[PDB]
Design a protein around this ligand. Structure first.
Ligand SMILES: *[C@@H]1O[C@H](CO)[C@@H](O[C@@H]2O[C@H](CO)[C@@H](O[C@@H]3O[C@H](CO[C@H]4O[C@H](CO[C@H]5O[C@H](CO)[C@@H](O)[C@H](O)[C@@H]5O[C@H]5O[C@H](CO)[C@@H](O)[C@H](O)[C@@H]5O)[C@@H](O)[C@H](O[C@H]5O[C@H](CO)[C@@H](O)[C@H](O)[C@@H]5O)[C@@H]4O)[C@@H](O)[C@H](O[C@H]4O[C@H](CO)[C@@H](O)[C@H](O)[C@@H]4O[C@H]4O[C@H](CO)[C@@H](O)[C@H](O)[C@@H]4O[C@H]4O[C@H](CO)[C@@H](O)[C@H](O)[C@@H]4O)[C@@H]3O)[C@H](O)[C@H]2NC(C)=O)[C@H](O)[C@H]1NC(C)=O
Ligand SMILES: *[C@@H]1O[C@H](CO)[C@@H](O[C@@H]2O[C@H](CO)[C@@H](O[C@@H]3O[C@H](CO)[C@@H](O)[C@H](O)[C@@H]3O)[C@H](O)[C@H]2NC(C)=O)[C@H](O)[C@H]1NC(C)=O
Ligand SMILES: *[C@@H]1O[C@H](CO)[C@@H](O[C@@H]2O[C@H](CO)[C@@H](O)[C@H](O)[C@H]2NC(C)=O)[C@H](O)[C@H]1NC(C)=O
Lengths: 104, 333, 108
């Protein structure tokens, strides 16, 4: 914050072992694909300051979403299709099915 | 009187930045605890609250006096003037001492330099619960602490024989779980700074089956038998059996959305969502079976006649079998 | 609302079916909504017993209707008889249960 780039210099110690403990991180929803260590400089109206960046690339898991919100849609659309086998004489059954599937 | 003189002589030429025996040998610290209450174990955040009375005793040859009084008993007014080990809990999301009305601390300096330092803590410790076998799951998840800046060569912790002593275990907020025991452990870990002596206390929790047994299992099995009730309604009334099926499916998906909303978002299959999935399958199979029944009545009536009565026997037997298998397996597993 | 399904005639199967299913699922959602207010406790409260008994009642009503429909067109005498008997048997039993529950839980 206070010291510009002619007063302080940031660097990672080891340049690849500076950040540890990533492979042990378990997230309930995501999964750490990899992580990057970047060294650069930013320029503001008051000076040029050093900067490091530790960047994670999380990828979201899909099992919960399939089992939770994709399957119900497919089953409701199939429950809508079943109405094609019902004869056209029953107007309270095919209407029932279709309307209910819409609501759902 | 003269205790003021003793306290003034102990702090004359005293540097509270240097551990006792800074360049001789590591400082042996004996740690004891007193678990007041183990707070609610919420699985959504993989955390649990605990409230303890952490006591640390070590030897300090600089706080060694020679007078008639054997022990000096002091409040928290002299804790910030002597050396105090920097014990921190390595798996605590958020923890804090107590300050009402006066900082909850105690300092007792014996005659030969032995210091006892006790404080009250409320730690939101972390433990990643493996939410399989839910709700027939058992956990044993720890509370780890160690020095922060002093490696194994400087500060060595060591449990006492009777170190950890739980309270009454009855007025605790362990609702869904049940305390069965604990065990202490000492190891040495490697860090970017050095080798540290890490102590651990493992608390064993066993999930009692009651809240989930009455919140999801009974509702879903009674919904299943409600779906079976359609097998006795006459096959000509179509909109009635179709309403049975579709409303049963709606309630089934709502109940699954709730049981799953109980525990956090996990990408694997637990033992409860498996149950609600089997029940969903049962309802969907009763519906599609009556579907093919009504459709086949137009094609072949005797098929449907033998099919209603076939299903009336085939469904409850398959459900009893499923239940038996599931329950027995998990109770043995 | 579940007990009303008895005074309906035996020819209207769609209606009585809707009555039964809707009431059973209203009792289910009521049990769920009633259990959310309390801590996640591992025993049964008094409200849990009241809701369990009402749930049992709706599942005895639905069952009586199912039996009536099963005996209809084969022994309509028996069906009508049981329907008429249940039109008096359910309300008195519910009243007795409410007198017992309220008496034994308000005296303490
Ligand atoms: C970024 O900014 C943040 C905001 O500024 C900043 O957070 C602040 O950090 C500082 C330093 O870490 C904190 O100040 C310290 O707080 C310690 C305890 O903190 C707890 O209590 C405060 C409230 O403090 C009141 O209560 C205590 C206990 O009674 C009193 O001791 C305080 O003086 C104070 O009392 C006044 O106010 C009361 C009302 O609350 C009145 O009732 C009372 O009458 C007084 O008027 C809480 O706010 C804290 O919560 C926060 O911190 C926790 C930490 O875990 C967080 O979890 C939480 O979320 C909050 O963020 C916490 O609960 C004090 O003990 C400490 O004072 C001692 O240390 C200093 C420095 O060494 C000494 O100079 C001082 O004298 C004290 O030492 C004496 O007393 C101790 C008692 O234990 C003795 O052991 C010791 O030997 C010594 O005794 C000697 O001197 C005495 C006279 O002083 C004498 O009587 C004796 O006889 C003997 O000679 C210090 O005040 C501050 O609270 C934080 N504020 C906040 C909002 O968080 C953060 O650090 C910054 N970050 C960075 C990176 O910089
Ligand atoms: C996530 O997003 C950040 C933000 O852009 C990405 O940081 C970028 O990373 C790339 C490669 O790691 C950098 O490119 C490099 O540029 C230097 C310039 O001298 C060059 O020498 C290198 O050969 C390379 O081309 C880029 O500068 C950097 N951007 C910033 C703003 O720092 C990051 O890569 C993304 N991925 C992950 C996993 O975080
Ligand atoms: C707590 O820690 C102490 C010390 O590490 C354990 O006490 C030891 O117990 C074993 C087996 O009972 C004895 O052979 C040792 O002599 C004991 N040592 C001391 C210093 O008492 C104690 O078992 C631990 N508590 C547990 C595991 O519940």
């Amino acid at each position: 914050y206070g010291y510009t780039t002619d007063d302080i210099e940031f660097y990672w110690r080891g340049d690849d072992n500076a950040v540890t403990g990533v492979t042990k991180i378990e997230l309930p929803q995501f999964s750490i694909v990899d992580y990057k260590l970047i060294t650069k400089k930013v320029v503001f109206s008051t000076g040029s300051y050093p900067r490091l960046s530790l960047s994670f690339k999380l990828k979201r898991n899909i099992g919960y979403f399939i089992l939770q919100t994709y399957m119900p849609s497919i089953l409701i659309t199939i429950l809508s299709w079943v109405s094609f086998w019902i004869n056209y004489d029953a107007s309270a059954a095919r209407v029932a099915l279709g309307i209910t599937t819409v609501l759902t | 009187g003269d205790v003021t003189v003793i306290l003034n002589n102990l702090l004359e030429g005293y540097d509270n930045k240097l551990r006792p025996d800074i360049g001789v040998k590591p400082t042996l610290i004996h740690t004891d605890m007193y678990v007041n209450s183990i707070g609610p174990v919420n699985a959504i955040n993989m955390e649990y609250t605990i409230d303890i009375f952490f006591a640390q005793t070590w030897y300090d040859r600089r706080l060694k006096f020679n007078s008639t009084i054997k022990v000096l008993r002091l409040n928290s007014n002299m804790v910030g003037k002597i050396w105090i080990p920097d014990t921190f809990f390595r798996n605590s999301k958020k923890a804090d001492a107590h300050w009402i009305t006066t900082p909850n601390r105690m300092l007792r300096i014996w005659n030969d330099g032995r210091v006892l330092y006790t404080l009250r803590l409320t730690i939101d410790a972390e433990c990643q619960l493996q939410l399989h076998n839910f709700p027939m799951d058992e956990h044993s998840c720890p509370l780890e602490f160690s020095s922060y800046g002093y490696p194994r060569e400087e500060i060595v912790y060591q449990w006492k024989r009777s170190s950890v002593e739980v309270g009454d275990t009855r007025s605790w907020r362990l609702y869904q779980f049940s305390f069965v025991g604990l065990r202490n452990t000492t190891e040495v870990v490697k860090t970017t700074s050095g080798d540290y002596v890490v102590m651990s206390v493992y608390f064993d929790l066993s999930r009692r089956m009651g809240y989930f047994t009455i919140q999801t299992y009974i509702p879903c099995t009674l919904i299943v038998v409600l779906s079976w009730v359609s097998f006795w309604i006459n096959k000509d009334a179509v909109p009635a059996r179709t309403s049975l099926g579709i409303t049963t499916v709606l309630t089934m998906t709502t109940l699954s959305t709730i049981a799953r909303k109980s525990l956090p978002k996990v990408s694997y299959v637990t033992a409860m969502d498996l149950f609600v999935s089997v029940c969903f399958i049962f309802v969907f199979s009763a519906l599609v079976e009556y579907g093919t029944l009504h459709y086949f009545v137009s094609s072949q009536p005797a098929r449907a006649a033998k099919m209603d009565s076939y299903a009336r026997i085939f469904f409850p037997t398959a459900f009893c079998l499923f239940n038996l298998v599931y329950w027995v397996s998990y109770l043995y597993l | 609302l579940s007990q009303v399904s008895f005074w309906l005639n035996r020819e209207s199967v769609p209606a009585r079916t809707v009555f039964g299913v809707t009431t059973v699922l209203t009792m289910t959602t009521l049990s769920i909504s009633a259990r959310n207010s309390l801590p996640k406790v591992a025993y049964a409260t008094a409200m849990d017993w009241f809701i369990a008994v009402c749930y049992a009642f709706v599942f005895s009503a639905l069952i009586e209707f199912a039996t009536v429909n099963y005996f209809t067109k084969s022994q309509p005498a028996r069906a009508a008889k049981i329907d008429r008997l249940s039109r008096i048997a359910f309300p008195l039993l519910f009243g007795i249960f409410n007198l017992v529950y309220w008496a034994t839980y308000l005296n303490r």
